[PDB]
Design a protein around this ligand. Sequence first.
Ligand SMILES: [Cl-]
Ligand SMILES: [N]
Ligand SMILES: [N]
Ligand SMILES: [Pt+2]
Ligand SMILES: [Pt+2]
Ligand SMILES: [Pt+2]
Length: 129
Amino acid sequence: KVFGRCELAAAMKRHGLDNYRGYSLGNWVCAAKFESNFNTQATNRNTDGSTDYGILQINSRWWCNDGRTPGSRNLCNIPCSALLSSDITASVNCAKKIVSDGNGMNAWVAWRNRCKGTDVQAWIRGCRL
Ligand SMILES: [Cl-]
Ligand SMILES: [N]
Ligand SMILES: [N]
Ligand SMILES: [Pt+2]
Ligand SMILES: [Pt+2]
Ligand SMILES: [Pt+2]
């Protein structure tokens, strides 16, 4: 599923991301925008051989099992394929653990480089929410 901008903001609020660890909803939607272009099915291979999965590009190095990432952790105790579902629950639940991990949303390089210190409220303007 390629989510609409307001469509996704609504889902994220539902699953309890808005203001989660102090990050307003615009932060989560801007990150999904530059990580995956709102596509639940997005995968990208890292040079280290790990892969990034789903709407928030959660990395197989720490967070999920894909069975081809040598010496990796599965800290969200899930298969990476669960992060590709049209239902974003699994991706939200793992994001909560990542953004609690100490570095906040800086764990998403595209958030640090393209959303951090921007007018992120603009990502939720016009949305019934
Ligand atoms: Cl693995
Ligand atoms: N939820
Ligand atoms: N949903
Ligand atoms: Pt957009
Ligand atoms: Pt949902
Ligand atoms: Pt939820």
